[PDB]
Design an enzyme around this catalytic site. Sequence first.
Site, PDB file in Angstrom:
ATOM      1  N   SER A  36       3.777   2.902   8.157  1.00 12.92           N
ATOM      2  CA  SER A  36       3.461   1.846   7.205  1.00 12.92           C
ATOM      3  C   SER A  36       4.689   1.437   6.425  1.00 12.92           C
ATOM      4  O   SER A  36       5.490   2.262   6.000  1.00 12.92           O
ATOM      5  CB  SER A  36       2.413   2.338   6.216  1.00 12.92           C
ATOM      6  OG  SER A  36       1.160   2.388   6.835  1.00 12.92           O
ATOM      7  N   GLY A  37       4.787   0.124   6.200  1.00 11.13           N
ATOM      8  CA  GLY A  37       5.894  -0.443   5.466  1.00 11.13           C
ATOM      9  C   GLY A  37       7.092  -0.800   6.313  1.00 11.13           C
ATOM     10  O   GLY A  37       7.976  -1.524   5.840  1.00 11.13           O
ATOM     11  N   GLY A  48       2.251   6.883   8.662  1.00  9.60           N
ATOM     12  CA  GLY A  48       3.641   7.196   8.368  1.00  9.60           C
ATOM     13  C   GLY A  48       4.618   6.114   8.805  1.00  9.60           C
ATOM     14  O   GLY A  48       5.778   6.144   8.386  1.00  9.60           O
ATOM     15  N   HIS A  63       0.815  -1.210   0.000  1.00  5.96           N
ATOM     16  CA  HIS A  63       0.000   0.000   0.000  1.00  5.96           C
ATOM     17  C   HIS A  63       0.852   1.264   0.000  1.00  5.96           C
ATOM     18  O   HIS A  63       0.316   2.356  -0.193  1.00  5.96           O
ATOM     19  CB  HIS A  63      -1.054  -0.014   1.111  1.00  5.96           C
ATOM     20  CG  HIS A  63      -0.598   0.413   2.457  1.00  5.96           C
ATOM     21  ND1 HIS A  63      -0.271  -0.454   3.477  1.00  5.96           N
ATOM     22  CD2 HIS A  63      -0.490   1.656   2.967  1.00  5.96           C
ATOM     23  CE1 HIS A  63       0.025   0.249   4.558  1.00  5.96           C
ATOM     24  NE2 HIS A  63      -0.100   1.531   4.271  1.00  5.96           N
ATOM     25  N   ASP A 101      -0.111  -7.579   1.769  1.00  6.06           N
ATOM     26  CA  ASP A 101       0.396  -6.199   1.772  1.00  6.06           C
ATOM     27  C   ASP A 101       1.920  -6.199   1.914  1.00  6.06           C
ATOM     28  O   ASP A 101       2.482  -5.954   2.985  1.00  6.06           O
ATOM     29  CB  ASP A 101      -0.283  -5.387   2.864  1.00  6.06           C
ATOM     30  CG  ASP A 101       0.000  -3.896   2.777  1.00  6.06           C
ATOM     31  OD1 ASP A 101       0.485  -3.444   1.728  1.00  6.06           O
ATOM     32  OD2 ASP A 101      -0.314  -3.182   3.762  1.00  6.06           O
TER      33      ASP A 101
END
Length: 223
Positions: free
Chosen positions: A177-178, A175, A40, A84
């Site tokens: 994320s990942g 922020g 995402h 994801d």
Amino acid sequence: IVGGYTCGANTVPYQVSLNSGYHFCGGSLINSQWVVSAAHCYKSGIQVRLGEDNINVVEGNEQFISASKSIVHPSYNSNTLNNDIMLIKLKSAASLNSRVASISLPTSCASAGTQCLISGWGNTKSSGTSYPDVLKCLKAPILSDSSCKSAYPGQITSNMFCAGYLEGGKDSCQGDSGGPVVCSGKLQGIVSWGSGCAQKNKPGVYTKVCNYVSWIKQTIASN
Ligand SMILES: NC(=[NH2+])N1CCCCC1
Ligand SMILES: [Ca+2]
């Protein structure tokens, strides 16, 4: 990260910032030329920033390397966030040292109750907005699948796990994320989704990396 602590400069040496003119997602360095992040977080025009602490000041340990190729998982579903995960290849290899280092992929899946380290430059408030400039850290346990499914009925697949605190107050946030979830020195999770941040009975949901090791290895070997 809500309810965390300041990590300290370069204490999380596998943490990367994905930059498209500004920080927008985290990621993890898994060898000198590849980063893993959340699907995402996909966009074109990614620069990977390694060796960062303060993302607004050049402190002297940074390496800035553009992406040459991004590969979103073949089965990523943006509506459900199943699968994801994405891989990013760097245009040139990073120089590895004590402050810029890869994180190992798991050989086994981690069990509920294992303590992990989650890190990022995301929002530090559950109501309102304050973005830090330096890297924040949070220690949190993996929750049982039954507690995870009870918190998010109908939404948890076999490719997800929950981590955090059912009482609220400590979580990853926008922020982050990942970014990485590291347990016993291995990358077990990717910051994926949740409902708000740090809310009671709504823990964070993370991509279960151990399900993807074969795909990661085969993809790197041929790209
Ligand atoms: N852990 C969370 N609550 N998250 C994940 C990151 C995005 C916002 C929701
Ligand atoms: Ca910096």
